Amino acid sequence: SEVPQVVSLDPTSIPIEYNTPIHDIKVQVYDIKGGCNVEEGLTIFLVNNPGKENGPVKISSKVNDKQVSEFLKDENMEKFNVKLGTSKHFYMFNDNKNSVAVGYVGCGSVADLSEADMKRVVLSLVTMLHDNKLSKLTVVFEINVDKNLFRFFLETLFYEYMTDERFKSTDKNVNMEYIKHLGVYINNADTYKEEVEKARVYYFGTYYASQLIAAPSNYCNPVSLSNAAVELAQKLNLEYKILGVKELEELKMGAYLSVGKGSMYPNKFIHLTYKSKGDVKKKIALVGKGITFDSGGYNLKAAPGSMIDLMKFDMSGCAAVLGCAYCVGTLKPENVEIHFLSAVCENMVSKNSYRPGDIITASNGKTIEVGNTDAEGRLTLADALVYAEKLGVDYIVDIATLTGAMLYSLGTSYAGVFGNNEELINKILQSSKTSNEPVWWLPIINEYRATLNSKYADINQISSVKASSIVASLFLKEFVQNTAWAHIDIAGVSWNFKARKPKGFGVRLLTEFVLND
Amino acid sequence: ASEVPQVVSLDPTSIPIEYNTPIHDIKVQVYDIKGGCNVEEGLTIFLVNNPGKENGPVKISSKVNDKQVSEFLKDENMEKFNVKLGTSKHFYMFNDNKNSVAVGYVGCGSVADLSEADMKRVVLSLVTMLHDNKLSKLTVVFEINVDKNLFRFFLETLFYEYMTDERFKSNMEYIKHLGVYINNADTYKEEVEKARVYYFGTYYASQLIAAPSNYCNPVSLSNAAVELAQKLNLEYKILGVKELEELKMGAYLSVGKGSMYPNKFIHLTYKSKGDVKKKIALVGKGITFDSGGYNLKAAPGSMIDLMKFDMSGCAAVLGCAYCVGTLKPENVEIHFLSAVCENMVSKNSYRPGDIITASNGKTIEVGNTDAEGRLTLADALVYAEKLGVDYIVDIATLTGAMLYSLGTSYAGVFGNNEELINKILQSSKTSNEPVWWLPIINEYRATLNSKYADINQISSSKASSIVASLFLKEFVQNTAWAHIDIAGVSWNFKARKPKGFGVRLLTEFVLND
Amino acid sequence: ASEVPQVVSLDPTSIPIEYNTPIHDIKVQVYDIKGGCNVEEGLTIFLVNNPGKENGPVKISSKVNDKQVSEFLKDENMEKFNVKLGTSKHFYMFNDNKNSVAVGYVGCGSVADLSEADMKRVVLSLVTMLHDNKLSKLTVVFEINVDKNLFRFFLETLFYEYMTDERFKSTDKNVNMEYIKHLGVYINNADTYKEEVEKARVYYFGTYYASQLIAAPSNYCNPVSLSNAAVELAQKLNLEYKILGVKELEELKMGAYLSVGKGSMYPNKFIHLTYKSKGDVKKKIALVGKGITFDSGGYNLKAAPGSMIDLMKFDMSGCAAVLGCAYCVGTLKPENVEIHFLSAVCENMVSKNSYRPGDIITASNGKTIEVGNTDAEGRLTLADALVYAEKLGVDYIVDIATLTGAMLYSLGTSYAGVFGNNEELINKILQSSKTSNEPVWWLPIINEYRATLNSKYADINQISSSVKASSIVASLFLKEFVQNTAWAHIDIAGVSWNFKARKPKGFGVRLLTEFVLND
Ligand SMILES: CC(C)(C)C(=O)N[C@@H](C(=O)NO)c1ccc(Br)cc1
Ligand SMILES: CC(C)(C)C(=O)N[C@@H](C(=O)NO)c1ccc(Br)cc1
Ligand SMILES: CC(C)(C)C(=O)N[C@@H](C(=O)NO)c1ccc(Br)cc1
Ligand SMILES: [Zn+2]
Numbered sequence A: 001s002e003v004p005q006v007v008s009l010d011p012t013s014i015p016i017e018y019n020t021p022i023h024d025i026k027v028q029v030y031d032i033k034g035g036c037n038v039e040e041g042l043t044i045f046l047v048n049n050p051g052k053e054n055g056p057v058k059i060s061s062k063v064n065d066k067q068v069s070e071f072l073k074d075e076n077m078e079k080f081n082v083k084l085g086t087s088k089h090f091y092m093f094n095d096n097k098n099s100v101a102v103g104y105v106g107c108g109s110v111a112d113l114s115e116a117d118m119k120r121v122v123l124s125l126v127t128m129l130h131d132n133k134l135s136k137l138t139v140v141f142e143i144n145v146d147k148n149l150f151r152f153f154l155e156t157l158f159y160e161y162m163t164d165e166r167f168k169s170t171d172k173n174v175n176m177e178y179i180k181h182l183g184v185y186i187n188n189a190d191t192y193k194e195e196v197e198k199a200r201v202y203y204f205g206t207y208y209a210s211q212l213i214a215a216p217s218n219y220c221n222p223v224s225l226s227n228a229a230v231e232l233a234q235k236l237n238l239e240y241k242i243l244g245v246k247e248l249e250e251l252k253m254g255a256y257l258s259v260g261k262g263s264m265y266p267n268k269f270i271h272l273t274y275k276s277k278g279d280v281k282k283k284i285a286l287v288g289k290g291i292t293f294d295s296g297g298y299n300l301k302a303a304p305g306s307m308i309d310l311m312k313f314d315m316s317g318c319a320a321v322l323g324c325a326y327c328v329g330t331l332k333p334e335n336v337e338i339h340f341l342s343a344v345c346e347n348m349v350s351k352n353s354y355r356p357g358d359i360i361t362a363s364n365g366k367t368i369e370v371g372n373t374d375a376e377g378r379l380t381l382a383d384a385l386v387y388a389e390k391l392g393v394d395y396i397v398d399i400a401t402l403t404g405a406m407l408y409s410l411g412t413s414y415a416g417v418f419g420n421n422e423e424l425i426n427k428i429l430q431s432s433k434t435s436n437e438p439v440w441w442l443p444i445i446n447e448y449r450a451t452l453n454s455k456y457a458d459i460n461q462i463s464s465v466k467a468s469s470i471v472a473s474l475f476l477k478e479f480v481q482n483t484a485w486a487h488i489d490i491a492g493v494s495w496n497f498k499a500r501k502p503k504g505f506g507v508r509l510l511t512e513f514v515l516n517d
Numbered sequence B: 001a002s003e004v005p006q007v008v009s010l011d012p013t014s015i016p017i018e019y020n021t022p023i024h025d026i027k028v029q030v031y032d033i034k035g036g037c038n039v040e041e042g043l044t045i046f047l048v049n050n051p052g053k054e055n056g057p058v059k060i061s062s063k064v065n066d067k068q069v070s071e072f073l074k075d076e077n078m079e080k081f082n083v084k085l086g087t088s089k090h091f092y093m094f095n096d097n098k099n100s101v102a103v104g105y106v107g108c109g110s111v112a113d114l115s116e117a118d119m120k121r122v123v124l125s126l127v128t129m130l131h132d133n134k135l136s137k138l139t140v141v142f143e144i145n146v147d148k149n150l151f152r153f154f155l156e157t158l159f160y161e162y163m164t165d166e167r168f169k170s171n172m173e174y175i176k177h178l179g180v181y182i183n184n185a186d187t188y189k190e191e192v193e194k195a196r197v198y199y200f201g202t203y204y205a206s207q208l209i210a211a212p213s214n215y216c217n218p219v220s221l222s223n224a225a226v227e228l229a230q231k232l233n234l235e236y237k238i239l240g241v242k243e244l245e246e247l248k249m250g251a252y253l254s255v256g257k258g259s260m261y262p263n264k265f266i267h268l269t270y271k272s273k274g275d276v277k278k279k280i281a282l283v284g285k286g287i288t289f290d291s292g293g294y295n296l297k298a299a300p301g302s303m304i305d306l307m308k309f310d311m312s313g314c315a316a317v318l319g320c321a322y323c324v325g326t327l328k329p330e331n332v333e334i335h336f337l338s339a340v341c342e343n344m345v346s347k348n349s350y351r352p353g354d355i356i357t358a359s360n361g362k363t364i365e366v367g368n369t370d371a372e373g374r375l376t377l378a379d380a381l382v383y384a385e386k387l388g389v390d391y392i393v394d395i396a397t398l399t400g401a402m403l404y405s406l407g408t409s410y411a412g413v414f415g416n417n418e419e420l421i422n423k424i425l426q427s428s429k430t431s432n433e434p435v436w437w438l439p440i441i442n443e444y445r446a447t448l449n450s451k452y453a454d455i456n457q458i459s460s461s462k463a464s465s466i467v468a469s470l471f472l473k474e475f476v477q478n479t480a481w482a483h484i485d486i487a488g489v490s491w492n493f494k495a496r497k498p499k500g501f502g503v504r505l506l507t508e509f510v511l512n513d
Numbered sequence C: 001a002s003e004v005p006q007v008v009s010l011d012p013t014s015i016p017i018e019y020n021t022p023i024h025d026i027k028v029q030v031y032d033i034k035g036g037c038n039v040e041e042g043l044t045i046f047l048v049n050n051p052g053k054e055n056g057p058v059k060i061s062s063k064v065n066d067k068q069v070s071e072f073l074k075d076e077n078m079e080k081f082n083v084k085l086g087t088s089k090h091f092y093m094f095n096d097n098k099n100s101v102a103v104g105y106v107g108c109g110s111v112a113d114l115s116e117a118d119m120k121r122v123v124l125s126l127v128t129m130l131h132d133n134k135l136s137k138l139t140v141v142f143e144i145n146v147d148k149n150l151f152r153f154f155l156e157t158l159f160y161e162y163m164t165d166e167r168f169k170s171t172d173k174n175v176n177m178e179y180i181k182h183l184g185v186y187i188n189n190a191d192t193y194k195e196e197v198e199k200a201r202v203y204y205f206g207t208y209y210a211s212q213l214i215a216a217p218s219n220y221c222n223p224v225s226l227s228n229a230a231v232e233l234a235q236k237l238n239l240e241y242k243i244l245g246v247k248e249l250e251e252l253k254m255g256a257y258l259s260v261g262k263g264s265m266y267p268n269k270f271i272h273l274t275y276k277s278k279g280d281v282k283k284k285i286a287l288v289g290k291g292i293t294f295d296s297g298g299y300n301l302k303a304a305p306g307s308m309i310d311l312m313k314f315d316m317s318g319c320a321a322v323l324g325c326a327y328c329v330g331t332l333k334p335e336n337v338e339i340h341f342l343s344a345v346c347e348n349m350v351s352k353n354s355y356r357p358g359d360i361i362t363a364s365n366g367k368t369i370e371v372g373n374t375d376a377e378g379r380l381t382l383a384d385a386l387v388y389a390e391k392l393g394v395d396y397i398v399d400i401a402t403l404t405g406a407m408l409y410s411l412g413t414s415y416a417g418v419f420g421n422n423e424e425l426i427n428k429i430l431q432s433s434k435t436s437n438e439p440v441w442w443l444p445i446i447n448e449y450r451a452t453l454n455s456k457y458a459d460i461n462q463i464s465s466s467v468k469a470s471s472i473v474a475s476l477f478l479k480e481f482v483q484n485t486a487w488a489h490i491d492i493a494g495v496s497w498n499f500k501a502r503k504p505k506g507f508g509v510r511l512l513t514e515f516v517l518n519d
């Protein structure tokens, strides 16, 4: 529990903001058929023109202001078009002789917005929120949107609006000022009002994961990460258990323990549990890869393009699980039992580190020949999956930044899912649709299994086939004997390279999976 | 036919092709296993397994009508051998008639349902025994469960691996008879001659791919396509440089600028005798050699010595043309297309940064001369859509990223039409040529926005297989279109030979449509 | 013995060693071919060739004491088969007593004198017949010409390849493993070859023992656990032993050897085994083996492509070969000779305590060395070991080491290179290469390259810069640490590991033993 230090200036805990400015925003949803009030702050219309690409802007909503309504006549709006991402600011006086701000955001010509298009709309909307000291924002929906995408709008809006300044000191933004009120005019308002607070939950779950990922490896260490998981569990009244080295040794987790041998931080196994009141119909284990830093070990990440400066995100799998734990622990689903697991450690270079060629024994008795110390994720997951299966669960779902090969297969937008059970895989895909975190199904090709046959050990850690994502899945499959299991590789989608910040991918995906099961 | 240019007189002027293979001379009969096996001649191999008992002992269940062989096949003798997948034993002995015979087995593991990859290992083990056999007859006894498709796949694979290409060469003898004992023999009899057609179609493609680039050039390959067309009574048309210029195929012509061999566009056609209800275009990548261009393949692992394989798309299409022209499906019209050229470094060569104009009017900024396949296919796809077909399916060794995504066993399929995707996947199942559906992610489309041209050839930077699909997608306007990337599965690296991947897949596609 | 340090309790504290192998339970019987062949239980294999006739027909010349089998193996029936090297066939038939017997052959090509490489292909072909078949007896009939050494090499290679290492198997132990209990050998002039049998069984395990160590991973085989194995072996053979720790090494001022191991969690251990004859000693020999239990390369990390860092447990081979030699010598017990088995064991790791590139260190003989590359750690350890060896007052010093990767580019994977300062000793090793059938080639120490080892500040450079012939330069470095004794250096970096078979060869054991025996 006590974080070790090299010097006194070393941080002993992860700075975490629980009360974010977003939580201070009062959100009201009105019915658009009742008319719009344009009084204070900025009012933004989400408009489109179906079939007519770059078509003119037309405000259909009734505005309860004679002056504003005249400004928004079709003749005045014709000069502007609805191209996706386009935004404009209007300045005018209303009926009560007050200066007001109005605008719009282009939503293209397609009636059904993609999750990427809606992301483009929101990102465009946030630009109007930045560098402007507004106290209230009003969004008028003049497009058709369902409950999931409406919730997705709010989640994305909240996430992008917030700015992480935990590690700023002399460069804190002197102009950062968040809105205090949020008004939303939309079709059939009563059906959408419930999505508001669910969005706020999904938001913080994602951003909590984001805070964990963005934190550097000197702040976020195997100990400090475990201490944070406890504090989270304590706040959510979740049962929690942190396994130390001695307990791991008794469980004979040689693969997981080997990875952390070269670290100054002791290995920590995170075990959070949520149990519903009443009869449990489904028991689920969510496993997150929690490598606080990945140097690669003696197979050091020194080659060009190894992205070692980023490798602090190698616990994004764990972060997604903890973020999910917040959401599950907050919304409190029924008839489910969830186990949040993470074999947390750090992959470093030392006299104590494990070497390429070392043969280690997993907690299930299988001997493993290490061919590459930078393939440490599958080793920690190996023991983690064995632990998970011993819990006697119905579903085992792991999430990990496992292979860099994902950048060559699916890229930076779609995560890959592997599994031994098509039913569970379909459940993940359905969750991907409703959570709007895109996932593509990839195969576990059994023909490659022969390349993992070790001459001396029971199995090789790596192949010597270049299809790393599939070969890694073959390895993990060997540690789930008779349980439905799925493996989500998020190595390519976890980090937003364009925005230079985490996505917190997985929180919404896993939560929708647990809730809609 | 056109005259192939030469640098020296010793330069070959034709691709050697073997049409009459020893496989075509093998008489194949299928017997029902319920009647017991007759072991009087040649080599007899039992395909056995042991379900639930991993690496379990061998036990021959079938009754054999020979006392000498029956004593050999008794359980006490066979239990000394195990059923580990691929494991083989065979013994020489005299039968009841004092004739010299050979009897043995191939282990088929402990799984009741064999994959196509498992069947490959079984066949390879079987072929090893054959390449060491002088006997005239091989008898295969199925004491395992296989359906019609897997049995035909067994025959296709056996025939293919058995055959050895010695065209460029300067022990054993091939068998004359093949006996097969299997449950429901009458049901599998129909698969025999279909397998033999799928055989040569795959092997013909293999012959073209294996043929080096000094033998297989744009002109000689087009000549081979013509000769094949004449044998199959197919309508054919070979477009030359002057006509390609008239059709304004700038993207295609730019790739072949640096070659000593003129660009040649292959157009074969199969038309049904009855009313035509479906028109299909099959498009093959036809780079006889890919040096990479001025973006030379110089980096380690760029595999420049294998770059004769860069035609595999063309070979697969031409191989399908054989199967289609032989089996002669009804109510369908199929167009076999291939923009064939050579990718070389010269003063006349296309350069990185060059802006070229495709036959559809789109200007393309070349960011990498080694991404030439999508360029040649671009004009090919524009040609294909002009034919007014229902389905367009292109197959190509397009991106090396496939080796990092699906590997060397599974090919990737991309497309703009899900129903067409499903038809390819269904064809993958029946042909036993494994293919996996990969997404065309539209969020990556923006990375192709050129500052000066209409579109970029390549991306700034990662998912190159998806980016390449996004590029090809820009050249099919209103037709169901699918794209098969076989760069990873085309070459059998372990065996040092082609697979002929795609031939059976494409044929099953047009047959079961 | 020392206690092996651990990071976690699950870290192994000893090298698993199998002394009693199934090969040791095999009874070997040798018969003269002129007496006729008996074909009964198990598998009976004929070794046939056809001199001058490439892929010629099979012809069994030996008399078979069975009417049925003799008819089966008549020339008319065997014509259909050929003698192509490595080709093998299985025969099934009933003998005179109405019993079913298994007979077969292995093709030995068309050359009358088989090379060592050809013989291994024959044996490997023979082993395939032993695998996946539950035989109780193997019978080998020699219808080819072999000398006493080649006959012994056959048995050694057969025993070695037949054996399977399952020390590190757990849930993937081969359930079908069942070794033969009897081995029959039919050969002309049998009594002359019978003496080679037990020599082969001793040479086999000596090779396999070294192989067991080499194949053993670095977390199992560390400087402490490896030295412990040497003690255990010496005790079983009643060899004198001394294991020097850091304190003793510090007192002997072995700065070069100690500097390599600075960055390791495992303390340095210097292995010193001694065999003395019970009679007057006429010859004194020191055998030095490189003993790096793992070579990460140091701060000159093995990060370049093809640097094979996952293999770097194999950096043991020299020490393992010397220990394997100690077994053969301790078992066969040669006369009038005293052998010193030496190895400076340590581990080259990256740490805060690690030695740096540029560091100047002092060897035990006073020479100062400027470190230009931490991955050239072998010659540094050998430097102190060669000084130690020469202080023993011996007649010959022979070192064996996986020293330079340049050997893969020079001699390849089959032939080891030998360097030296004494021509007569070099020729003795070459003769040992002949009799042991472990291929060794003589490579030159080119003195013109010595000037590139001239350090600006230290007495001598660890490595060169302008040569790129690392193997020769490494020898030039080592020569500077042997003042006035015949010394030879065997670089086995290329031949130690069998890449195709993914296993060690145990190269050096038979070579060094033949060297000690015939001297
Ligand atoms: C093949 C290899 C380079 C070893 C790899 O995929 N490494 C993982 C990794 O660090 N596993 O622990 C990896 C994962 C994500 C990214 Br981005 C890069 C590399
Ligand atoms: C990104 C780049 C390395 C240029 C590539 O995808 N090359 C293709 C190619 O040359 N297509 O024409 C490629 C295709 C197959 C193989 Br194997 C390697 C490279
Ligand atoms: C010149 C250099 C490439 C540094 C070399 O010879 N290295 C040794 C070595 O690491 N000695 O300690 C070496 C030895 C064996 C093999 Br395989 C590769 C490199
Ligand atoms: Zn890693």
Ligand SMILES: [Zn+2]
Binding pocket: A291, A294, A314, A374, A376, A377, A401, A402
């Ligand atoms: Zn990692």
Ligand SMILES: [Zn+2]
Binding pocket: B290, B292, B369, B370, B371, B372, B373
């Ligand atoms: Zn190319």
Ligand SMILES: [Zn+2]
Binding pocket: B287, B290, B310, B370, B372, B373, B397, B398
């Ligand atoms: Zn190409």
Ligand SMILES: [Zn+2]
Binding pocket: C295, C297, C374, C375, C376, C377, C378
């Ligand atoms: Zn080294």
Ligand SMILES: [Zn+2]
Binding pocket: C292, C295, C315, C375, C377, C378, C402, C403
């Ligand atoms: Zn070394």
